[PDB]
Structures are given as structure tokens and as C-alpha cells.
Amino acid sequence: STGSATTTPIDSLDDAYITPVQIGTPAQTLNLDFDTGSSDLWVFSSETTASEVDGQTIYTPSKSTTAKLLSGATWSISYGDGSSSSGDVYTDTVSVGGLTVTGQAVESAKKVSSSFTEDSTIDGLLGLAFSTLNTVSPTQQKTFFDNAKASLDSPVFTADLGYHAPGTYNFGFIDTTAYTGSITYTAVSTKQGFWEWTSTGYAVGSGTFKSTSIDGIADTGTTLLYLPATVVSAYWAQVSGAKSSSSVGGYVFPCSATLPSFTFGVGSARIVIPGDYIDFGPISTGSSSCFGGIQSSAGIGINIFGDVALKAAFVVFNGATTPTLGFASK
Ligand code: NA
């Protein structure tokens, strides 16, 4: 079997991407943030504290003839951005782009932090990292991909994020029309539960390529590209008036600037992020100071190839016995 779903940026900056997911019988469609950096499928629901819902579509398990309470199961998660959610668990029928999993753990939120309430466009998360990160207790649960894997034509899913435009998540097949040239595959460590891999270096604009290993995670749930402070300083040094602002919380640049591209290596291959992709616009409405798309990973304790880097590529998440990543230009 296969599935194929369109993913749509939630706003004009590509802050995140929502994909419609069918839950239950009859189907309840919710717009979920597919997150290769986490392993919980959780939703706004009929159980979510009323004051903490502000325009989201909710899952109502009592209206689903296939929902069953997973008795005694709870979950609680804390993301890199300080946001959080928690609640109890149902099993139900979950379909993404025509691919159906029966008995999927659907984690129903009783509580969500302010950043979730404040985003009316995201109905929940669908994690696509390794199931060893799933937070359900006392019985850890499998991701949608882990449940689907055995039924898929090939044990893979692909992320084809758009720049200010819709993209695609495909499950169980590589669309050979969606990229140019060849896919370059690179080794993955699952030691941290992430799609963790080692980039072979970087270049800034038309600059020479610096050969250097950069360990990091491929994370569709993180907006920006977080890299070591050396690399990030080398990038913003090429932008007149760019500086790191304590008060704003990272690199800002004059909104009059033309930003240079950023290239990252995948083995002997090169993925070029156009300069436009690194522009996250004014820091506040009306400001001439703009927020950078490339930021320091210092403090975070890991490098993160977030949407700024991934949307420049056709990315293959190979869930074979020995998992690998694939990157192609497109
Ligand atoms: Na922000």
C-alpha cells in the first residue's frame, strides 16, 4: 500500500505545514503538523480544557464507532520550543492520503500550552521520529509510520516541503518525478530516537565549500535551520548590518538586504538553500529588522535541519532495517 497527502504552509512565512488526517469512523478530518522530530500522534479533542481551545478542530472519540479508550494510558510531551501537551489515549482508525492504519494510538489532549492554543491552524501533531521517543505510559505506542511500515510497498516516507507553497508527504514509494538528478543516501543514527545524520560541510553564497562534519537531525517540525555558532557567524558575516540580538533571541538583518544562499553537504552532494528561504520577515509588524532563518544551535545541544533546509530538498526517510536518509535537489 501507499499514501500521498498534500502539506500546506500555515502562514506566509512557512512557520509550519499542516496535512489533513482522517481519524475515526465516520472520518473526522484534523490538520496535523507532521513532525519527524517527535513520535506522538496527539490531537485537540472533546477532552481538551475548554479555555485552551481557540478555533482548532477537535477529535471527539465518543462520535467514532472504531474508537476504544486505551485504558490506563497517559502521555505528556515537552518540545524544544518549550511548548507542551498531555492527556489520555484512544486507539482508532487513522488514514493519511489514502493509507489506513487500524488501532493507531491517538493521544487525546486534556491540556495544551499557550503556543498550541494561540495557533488555530494546527489541530495536533503526527510524530514521524523513532517509536522509542513515544511518551505513552505505561505501554509505549508506535508511530503511524511504524504501524504502516509492513503494509507499505517500500518501508519509506518522503517529505517534499514547498517554499511559500504546498508540498507532499508520500508513504511507501519514491516519486521519481518530484526531484532532479539522483538521491544521495547518508547514514542515520537512531541512538537519540531522531533521523540523525552527518552533513559533510557548508558554503555561504558563491563561497568555497568548507569540508566539516555537522551532526544534526532532519526535523520537519522545526521551522528554522539551527547550526553551530561558527557556521552561523560565517553566514551572517556576509550580510551587511546582520547581528545576533539577545533581546530578539537570535540573528536579525536589515529588511533591505539581499541574503546569500547557504549550501549543505550530503556525502559528495550539495543542497543549495536560496537566500529568500532564510528571510523570516520583520521581527514585529512594521519593523525594518528581519528575523534570520539560520540560527545558532548553541544551548539546544543538537543541530537541527529544520524546514528552511528540508524544503530545499526532496527528502527520503528510509525506514529499512538499517534506516538511512536520502536528499535530492528539486
Ligand atoms: Na518567532
Coordinates of N, CA and C in Angstrom, one line a residue, residues 30-237:
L30 N -8.6 16.2 10.7 CA -7.9 17.2 11.5 C -6.6 17.5 10.8
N31 N -6.2 18.8 10.9 CA -5.0 19.3 10.2 C -3.8 19.1 11.1
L32 N -2.9 18.2 10.9 CA -1.8 17.8 11.8 C -0.5 18.3 11.3
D33 N 0.4 18.7 12.2 CA 1.8 19.1 11.9 C 2.7 17.8 11.9
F34 N 3.0 17.3 10.7 CA 3.8 16.1 10.6 C 5.2 16.5 11.1
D35 N 5.8 15.7 12.1 CA 7.0 16.2 12.9 C 8.0 15.0 12.9
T36 N 9.0 15.0 12.1 CA 10.0 14.0 12.0 C 10.9 14.1 13.2
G37 N 10.7 15.1 14.1 CA 11.5 15.2 15.4 C 10.8 14.7 16.6
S38 N 9.6 14.1 16.5 CA 8.9 13.6 17.7 C 8.0 12.4 17.3
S39 N 7.5 11.7 18.3 CA 6.9 10.3 18.0 C 5.6 10.1 18.6
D40 N 4.8 11.2 18.9 CA 3.5 11.1 19.4 C 2.5 11.6 18.4
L41 N 1.4 11.0 18.2 CA 0.3 11.5 17.4 C -0.7 12.0 18.4
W42 N -0.8 13.3 18.6 CA -1.7 13.9 19.6 C -2.6 15.0 18.9
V43 N -3.8 15.1 19.4 CA -4.9 15.9 18.8 C -5.6 16.7 19.9
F44 N -6.0 17.9 19.6 CA -7.1 18.7 20.2 C -8.3 17.7 20.2
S45 N -9.0 17.7 21.3 CA -10.2 16.8 21.4 C -11.3 17.4 22.2
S46 N -12.4 16.6 22.3 CA -13.5 16.9 23.2 C -13.1 16.9 24.7
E47 N -11.8 16.4 25.0 CA -11.3 16.3 26.4 C -10.5 17.5 26.7
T48 N -10.1 18.3 25.7 CA -9.1 19.4 25.9 C -9.8 20.5 26.8
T49 N -9.1 20.9 27.9 CA -9.6 22.1 28.7 C -10.2 23.2 27.8
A50 N -11.5 23.5 27.9 CA -12.3 24.4 27.1 C -11.5 25.7 26.8
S51 N -11.0 26.4 27.8 CA -10.3 27.7 27.7 C -9.0 27.6 26.9
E52 N -8.5 26.3 26.6 CA -7.2 26.1 25.9 C -7.5 25.7 24.4
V53 N -8.8 25.8 24.0 CA -9.1 25.6 22.6 C -9.6 27.0 22.1
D54 N -9.0 27.4 20.9 CA -9.3 28.7 20.3 C -9.3 28.5 18.7
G55 N -10.3 27.8 18.2 CA -10.5 27.7 16.8 C -10.0 26.4 16.2
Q56 N -9.3 25.6 16.9 CA -8.8 24.3 16.4 C -10.1 23.4 16.2
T57 N -9.9 22.5 15.2 CA -10.8 21.3 15.0 C -10.5 20.2 16.0
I58 N -11.5 19.7 16.7 CA -11.2 18.7 17.8 C -11.7 17.3 17.3
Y59 N -10.9 16.3 17.8 CA -11.3 14.9 17.7 C -12.3 14.6 18.8
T60 N -13.4 14.0 18.5 CA -14.5 13.6 19.5 C -14.6 12.1 19.5
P61 N -13.9 11.3 20.4 CA -13.8 9.9 20.3 C -15.2 9.3 20.4
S62 N -16.1 9.9 21.2 CA -17.4 9.3 21.5 C -18.3 9.3 20.2
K63 N -17.9 10.0 19.2 CA -18.6 10.1 17.9 C -18.0 9.1 16.9
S64 N -16.9 8.4 17.3 CA -16.3 7.4 16.4 C -16.6 6.0 16.8
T65 N -17.2 5.2 15.9 CA -17.6 3.8 16.2 C -16.4 2.9 16.4
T66 N -15.2 3.3 16.0 CA -14.0 2.5 16.0 C -13.0 2.9 17.1
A67 N -13.4 4.0 17.9 CA -12.5 4.5 19.0 C -12.7 3.5 20.2
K68 N -11.5 3.2 20.8 CA -11.5 2.5 22.1 C -10.5 3.2 23.0
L69 N -11.0 3.5 24.3 CA -10.1 4.0 25.3 C -8.9 3.0 25.5
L70 N -7.7 3.4 25.4 CA -6.5 2.5 25.8 C -6.4 2.7 27.3
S71 N -7.0 1.8 28.0 CA -7.3 2.0 29.5 C -6.0 2.2 30.3
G72 N -5.9 3.2 31.0 CA -4.8 3.5 32.0 C -3.6 4.2 31.3
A73 N -3.7 4.4 30.0 CA -2.6 5.0 29.2 C -2.6 6.5 29.4
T74 N -1.5 7.1 29.6 CA -1.4 8.6 29.6 C -0.2 9.0 28.7
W75 N -0.1 10.3 28.5 CA 1.1 10.8 27.7 C 1.3 12.3 28.2
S76 N 2.5 12.7 28.1 CA 3.0 14.0 28.4 C 4.2 14.3 27.6
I77 N 4.2 15.4 26.8 CA 5.4 15.8 26.0 C 5.8 17.2 26.1
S78 N 7.1 17.5 26.0 CA 7.8 18.8 26.1 C 8.7 18.9 24.8
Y79 N 8.4 19.9 24.0 CA 9.1 20.2 22.8 C 10.3 21.1 23.0
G80 N 11.3 21.2 22.1 CA 12.4 22.0 22.1 C 12.1 23.5 22.3
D81 N 10.9 23.9 21.8 CA 10.5 25.4 21.8 C 9.8 25.7 23.2
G82 N 9.8 24.8 24.2 CA 9.2 25.0 25.5 C 7.7 24.7 25.6
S83 N 7.1 24.4 24.4 CA 5.6 24.0 24.4 C 5.4 22.6 24.9
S84 N 4.2 22.3 25.2 CA 3.9 21.0 25.9 C 2.4 20.7 25.7
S85 N 2.1 19.4 25.9 CA 0.7 18.9 25.9 C 0.7 17.6 26.7
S86 N -0.5 17.1 27.0 CA -0.7 15.9 27.8 C -2.1 15.4 27.8
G87 N -2.4 14.2 28.1 CA -3.7 13.7 28.2 C -3.8 12.2 28.3
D88 N -4.9 11.6 27.8 CA -5.1 10.1 27.7 C -5.1 9.7 26.3
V89 N -5.4 8.4 26.1 CA -5.1 7.7 24.7 C -6.3 6.9 24.3
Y90 N -6.6 7.0 23.0 CA -7.6 6.1 22.4 C -6.9 5.4 21.3
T91 N -7.3 4.2 20.9 CA -7.0 3.6 19.6 C -8.1 3.9 18.6
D92 N -7.8 4.2 17.4 CA -8.7 4.4 16.3 C -8.1 4.2 15.0
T93 N -8.9 4.2 13.9 CA -8.6 4.1 12.5 C -8.0 5.5 12.1
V94 N -6.8 5.5 11.6 CA -6.2 6.8 11.1 C -5.7 6.6 9.7
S95 N -6.1 7.5 8.8 CA -5.8 7.5 7.3 C -5.1 8.8 7.0
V96 N -3.9 8.7 6.3 CA -3.2 9.8 5.7 C -3.2 9.5 4.2
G97 N -3.7 10.4 3.4 CA -3.6 10.4 1.9 C -3.9 9.0 1.4
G98 N -5.0 8.4 1.9 CA -5.5 7.1 1.4 C -4.8 5.8 2.0
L99 N -3.8 6.0 2.9 CA -3.1 4.9 3.6 C -3.7 4.8 5.0
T100 N -4.3 3.6 5.4 CA -5.1 3.5 6.6 C -4.3 2.6 7.6
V101 N -4.3 3.0 8.8 CA -3.8 2.2 10.0 C -5.0 2.0 10.9
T102 N -5.3 0.7 11.2 CA -6.3 0.4 12.3 C -5.5 0.3 13.6
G103 N -6.1 0.7 14.7 CA -5.5 0.5 16.0 C -4.4 1.5 16.3
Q104 N -4.4 2.6 15.6 CA -3.3 3.7 15.9 C -3.6 4.3 17.2
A105 N -2.6 4.5 18.0 CA -2.7 5.3 19.3 C -2.9 6.8 18.9
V106 N -4.1 7.3 19.3 CA -4.4 8.7 19.1 C -4.4 9.3 20.5
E107 N -3.5 10.2 20.8 CA -3.3 10.7 22.1 C -4.1 12.0 22.2
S108 N -5.1 12.0 23.1 CA -6.2 13.0 23.2 C -5.7 14.0 24.2
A109 N -5.7 15.3 23.9 CA -5.1 16.3 24.8 C -6.1 16.7 25.8
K110 N -5.7 16.6 27.1 CA -6.5 17.2 28.2 C -6.0 18.7 28.4
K111 N -4.7 18.9 28.2 CA -4.0 20.1 28.4 C -3.1 20.4 27.2
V112 N -3.0 21.7 26.8 CA -2.0 22.1 25.8 C -1.4 23.4 26.3
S113 N -0.2 23.7 26.0 CA 0.4 25.0 26.4 C -0.1 26.1 25.5
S114 N 0.3 27.3 25.9 CA -0.3 28.6 25.3 C 0.0 28.6 23.7
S115 N 1.2 28.2 23.3 CA 1.6 28.3 21.9 C 0.7 27.4 21.0
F116 N 0.2 26.3 21.6 CA -0.8 25.5 20.8 C -2.1 26.2 20.7
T117 N -2.6 26.7 21.9 CA -3.9 27.4 21.9 C -3.9 28.5 20.9
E118 N -2.8 29.2 20.9 CA -2.6 30.5 20.1 C -2.5 30.2 18.6
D119 N -2.2 29.0 18.2 CA -2.2 28.6 16.8 C -3.5 27.8 16.4
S120 N -4.5 28.5 15.9 CA -5.8 27.9 15.5 C -5.6 27.0 14.3
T121 N -4.5 27.0 13.6 CA -4.4 26.3 12.3 C -3.9 24.9 12.5
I122 N -3.3 24.5 13.7 CA -2.7 23.2 14.0 C -3.6 22.5 15.0
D123 N -4.1 21.3 14.5 CA -5.1 20.5 15.3 C -4.4 19.5 16.1
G124 N -3.1 19.4 16.0 CA -2.2 18.4 16.7 C -1.0 18.1 15.9
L125 N -0.3 17.1 16.3 CA 1.0 16.6 15.8 C 0.9 15.2 15.3
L126 N 1.6 14.8 14.3 CA 1.7 13.4 13.9 C 3.2 13.1 13.9
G127 N 3.8 12.5 15.0 CA 5.2 12.3 15.0 C 5.7 11.2 14.0
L128 N 6.9 11.4 13.5 CA 7.5 10.5 12.5 C 9.0 10.2 12.8
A129 N 9.3 10.5 14.1 CA 10.7 10.1 14.6 C 10.5 8.6 15.0
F130 N 11.5 8.0 15.7 CA 11.5 6.6 16.0 C 10.6 6.4 17.2
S131 N 9.9 5.2 17.3 CA 8.9 5.0 18.3 C 9.5 4.9 19.7
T132 N 10.8 4.8 19.8 CA 11.5 4.8 21.1 C 11.3 6.1 21.9
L133 N 10.9 7.2 21.1 CA 10.6 8.5 21.8 C 9.1 8.7 22.2
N134 N 8.3 7.8 21.8 CA 6.8 8.0 22.1 C 6.7 8.1 23.6
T135 N 5.8 8.9 24.1 CA 5.7 9.2 25.5 C 4.6 8.5 26.2
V136 N 3.8 7.7 25.6 CA 2.7 7.0 26.2 C 3.2 6.0 27.3
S137 N 2.6 6.1 28.5 CA 2.9 5.3 29.7 C 1.6 4.7 30.1
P138 N 1.6 3.4 30.7 CA 2.8 2.6 30.9 C 3.3 1.7 29.7
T139 N 2.6 1.8 28.6 CA 2.8 0.9 27.4 C 3.2 1.9 26.2
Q140 N 4.4 1.9 25.8 CA 4.8 2.9 24.8 C 4.1 2.4 23.5
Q141 N 3.7 3.4 22.7 CA 3.0 3.2 21.4 C 3.8 3.5 20.2
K142 N 3.4 2.9 19.1 CA 4.1 3.0 17.7 C 3.6 4.2 17.0
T143 N 4.5 4.9 16.2 CA 4.1 5.9 15.3 C 3.2 5.4 14.2
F144 N 2.6 6.3 13.5 CA 1.8 6.0 12.3 C 2.6 5.3 11.3
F145 N 3.9 5.7 11.0 CA 4.8 5.1 10.0 C 5.2 3.7 10.5
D146 N 5.5 3.6 11.8 CA 5.9 2.2 12.3 C 4.7 1.3 12.1
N147 N 3.5 1.7 12.5 CA 2.3 0.8 12.2 C 2.1 0.5 10.8
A148 N 2.3 1.4 9.9 CA 2.0 1.3 8.4 C 3.1 0.4 7.7
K149 N 4.3 0.4 8.3 CA 5.6 0.1 7.5 C 5.4 -1.3 6.8
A150 N 4.9 -2.3 7.5 CA 4.8 -3.7 7.0 C 3.9 -3.8 5.8
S151 N 2.8 -2.9 5.7 CA 1.9 -2.9 4.6 C 2.4 -2.1 3.4
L152 N 3.4 -1.2 3.7 CA 3.8 -0.3 2.6 C 4.5 -1.1 1.5
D153 N 4.5 -0.6 0.2 CA 5.2 -1.2 -0.9 C 6.7 -1.1 -0.6
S154 N 7.2 -0.1 0.0 CA 8.6 0.1 0.4 C 8.6 0.8 1.7
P155 N 9.5 0.5 2.7 CA 9.4 1.0 4.0 C 10.0 2.4 4.2
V156 N 9.4 3.3 3.5 CA 9.9 4.7 3.4 C 8.7 5.7 3.4
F157 N 9.1 6.9 3.8 CA 8.2 8.1 3.5 C 9.1 9.2 3.1
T158 N 8.5 10.1 2.3 CA 9.3 11.3 1.7 C 8.6 12.6 2.1
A159 N 9.4 13.6 2.3 CA 9.0 15.0 2.6 C 9.4 15.8 1.5
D160 N 8.5 16.5 0.8 CA 8.7 17.4 -0.3 C 8.1 18.7 0.1
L161 N 8.7 19.5 1.0 CA 8.1 20.8 1.5 C 8.2 21.8 0.4
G162 N 7.2 22.7 0.3 CA 7.2 23.8 -0.6 C 7.7 25.1 0.1
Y163 N 8.3 26.0 -0.8 CA 8.7 27.3 -0.3 C 7.5 28.2 -0.6
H164 N 6.8 28.7 0.4 CA 5.6 29.6 0.3 C 4.6 28.9 -0.6
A165 N 4.4 27.6 -0.5 CA 3.6 26.8 -1.5 C 3.4 25.4 -0.9
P166 N 2.3 24.8 -1.2 CA 2.1 23.4 -0.8 C 3.1 22.4 -1.3
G167 N 3.2 21.3 -0.6 CA 4.2 20.2 -0.9 C 3.5 18.9 -0.7
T168 N 4.2 17.9 -0.4 CA 3.7 16.5 -0.4 C 4.5 15.7 0.6
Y169 N 3.7 14.9 1.4 CA 4.2 13.7 2.1 C 3.7 12.5 1.4
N170 N 4.6 11.6 1.0 CA 4.3 10.3 0.4 C 4.7 9.2 1.4
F171 N 3.9 8.1 1.4 CA 4.3 6.9 2.2 C 4.3 5.7 1.3
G172 N 5.5 5.0 1.3 CA 5.6 3.6 0.7 C 6.1 3.7 -0.7
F173 N 6.4 4.9 -1.2 CA 7.0 5.0 -2.6 C 7.8 6.3 -2.7
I174 N 8.8 6.2 -3.6 CA 9.6 7.4 -4.1 C 9.0 7.8 -5.4
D175 N 8.5 9.1 -5.4 CA 8.0 9.7 -6.7 C 9.3 10.2 -7.5
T176 N 9.7 9.5 -8.5 CA 10.9 9.8 -9.2 C 10.7 11.0 -10.1
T177 N 9.5 11.6 -10.2 CA 9.2 12.8 -11.0 C 9.3 14.1 -10.1
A178 N 9.4 13.9 -8.7 CA 9.4 15.0 -7.8 C 10.8 15.6 -7.5
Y179 N 11.9 15.1 -8.1 CA 13.3 15.6 -7.9 C 14.0 15.6 -9.2
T180 N 15.2 16.3 -9.2 CA 16.2 16.3 -10.3 C 17.4 15.6 -9.8
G181 N 18.1 15.1 -10.8 CA 19.4 14.3 -10.6 C 19.1 13.1 -9.8
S182 N 20.0 12.7 -8.9 CA 20.0 11.5 -8.1 C 19.7 11.8 -6.7
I183 N 19.2 10.8 -5.9 CA 19.1 10.9 -4.5 C 20.4 10.4 -3.9
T184 N 21.0 11.2 -3.0 CA 22.2 10.8 -2.3 C 21.8 10.3 -0.9
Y185 N 22.0 9.1 -0.5 CA 21.7 8.5 0.8 C 22.9 8.6 1.7
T186 N 22.6 8.8 3.0 CA 23.6 9.0 4.1 C 23.1 8.3 5.3
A187 N 24.0 7.8 6.1 CA 23.8 7.0 7.3 C 23.0 7.8 8.4
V188 N 22.2 7.0 9.1 CA 21.3 7.5 10.2 C 21.7 6.8 11.5
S189 N 21.9 7.6 12.6 CA 22.0 7.0 14.0 C 20.6 7.2 14.6
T190 N 20.0 6.1 15.2 CA 18.7 6.1 15.9 C 19.0 6.2 17.4
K191 N 20.2 6.5 17.8 CA 20.6 6.3 19.2 C 19.9 7.3 20.1
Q192 N 19.4 8.4 19.5 CA 18.7 9.5 20.2 C 17.2 9.5 19.8
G193 N 16.7 8.5 19.0 CA 15.4 8.4 18.5 C 15.0 9.3 17.3
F194 N 16.0 10.0 16.8 CA 15.8 11.0 15.7 C 16.4 10.5 14.4
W195 N 16.0 11.1 13.3 CA 16.6 10.9 12.0 C 18.0 11.7 12.0
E196 N 18.9 11.2 12.8 CA 20.2 11.9 13.0 C 21.2 11.5 12.0
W197 N 21.9 12.4 11.4 CA 22.8 12.2 10.2 C 24.0 13.2 10.3
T198 N 25.0 13.1 9.4 CA 26.2 13.9 9.5 C 26.3 14.6 8.1
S199 N 26.1 15.9 8.1 CA 26.4 16.7 6.9 C 27.9 16.8 6.7
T200 N 28.3 16.9 5.4 CA 29.8 16.9 5.1 C 30.3 18.3 5.0
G201 N 29.5 19.3 5.1 CA 30.0 20.7 5.3 C 29.1 21.7 4.7
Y202 N 29.6 22.9 4.5 CA 28.7 24.0 4.0 C 29.5 25.0 3.2
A203 N 28.7 25.8 2.5 CA 29.3 27.0 1.8 C 28.2 28.2 2.0
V204 N 28.7 29.4 2.0 CA 27.9 30.6 2.1 C 28.0 31.3 0.7
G205 N 26.8 31.6 0.2 CA 26.7 32.1 -1.2 C 27.6 31.4 -2.2
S206 N 28.4 32.2 -3.0 CA 29.3 31.6 -4.0 C 30.6 31.3 -3.4
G207 N 30.8 31.3 -2.1 CA 32.0 30.9 -1.3 C 32.4 29.5 -1.5
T208 N 33.7 29.2 -1.3 CA 34.3 27.8 -1.2 C 33.6 27.0 -0.2
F209 N 33.4 25.7 -0.5 CA 32.8 24.7 0.4 C 33.9 24.3 1.4
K210 N 33.4 24.4 2.7 CA 34.2 24.0 3.9 C 33.8 22.6 4.2
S211 N 34.7 21.7 4.1 CA 34.5 20.2 4.5 C 34.6 20.1 6.0
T212 N 33.5 19.7 6.6 CA 33.5 19.6 8.1 C 32.2 18.8 8.4
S213 N 32.3 17.9 9.3 CA 31.2 17.0 9.8 C 30.3 17.8 10.7
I214 N 29.0 17.9 10.4 CA 27.9 18.6 11.2 C 26.8 17.5 11.5
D215 N 26.9 16.9 12.6 CA 25.9 16.0 13.2 C 24.6 16.8 13.4
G216 N 23.5 16.3 13.0 CA 22.2 17.0 13.2 C 21.0 16.1 12.9
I217 N 19.8 16.6 13.1 CA 18.6 15.8 12.9 C 17.8 16.5 11.8
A218 N 17.1 15.6 11.0 CA 16.2 16.1 10.0 C 14.8 16.2 10.6
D219 N 14.3 17.4 10.8 CA 13.2 17.7 11.7 C 12.2 18.6 11.0
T220 N 11.1 18.0 10.4 CA 10.1 18.7 9.7 C 9.2 19.6 10.6
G221 N 9.3 19.3 11.9 CA 8.5 20.1 12.9 C 9.2 21.3 13.5
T222 N 10.5 21.5 13.0 CA 11.2 22.7 13.4 C 11.3 23.7 12.2
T223 N 11.0 25.0 12.4 CA 10.9 25.9 11.3 C 12.3 26.2 10.7
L224 N 13.2 26.5 11.5 CA 14.5 27.1 11.0 C 15.6 26.1 10.9
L225 N 16.8 26.5 10.5 CA 18.0 25.7 10.4 C 18.9 26.2 11.6
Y226 N 19.2 25.2 12.5 CA 20.0 25.5 13.7 C 21.3 24.8 13.5
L227 N 22.4 25.6 13.5 CA 23.8 25.0 13.2 C 24.8 25.6 14.2
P228 N 26.0 25.0 14.2 CA 26.9 25.5 15.2 C 27.2 27.0 15.0
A229 N 27.6 27.7 16.1 CA 27.8 29.1 16.1 C 28.9 29.6 15.1
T230 N 29.9 28.8 14.9 CA 30.9 29.1 13.9 C 30.3 29.2 12.5
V231 N 29.5 28.3 12.2 CA 28.9 28.2 10.8 C 28.0 29.4 10.7
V232 N 27.1 29.6 11.6 CA 26.0 30.7 11.6 C 26.8 32.0 11.6
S233 N 27.9 32.3 12.2 CA 28.6 33.6 12.3 C 29.2 33.8 10.9
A234 N 29.7 32.7 10.3 CA 30.3 32.8 8.9 C 29.2 33.2 7.9
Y235 N 27.9 32.7 8.1 CA 26.8 33.1 7.2 C 26.5 34.5 7.4
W236 N 26.1 35.0 8.5 CA 25.6 36.3 8.7 C 26.7 37.4 8.6
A237 N 27.9 37.0 8.6 CA 29.1 38.0 8.4 C 28.9 38.4 6.9

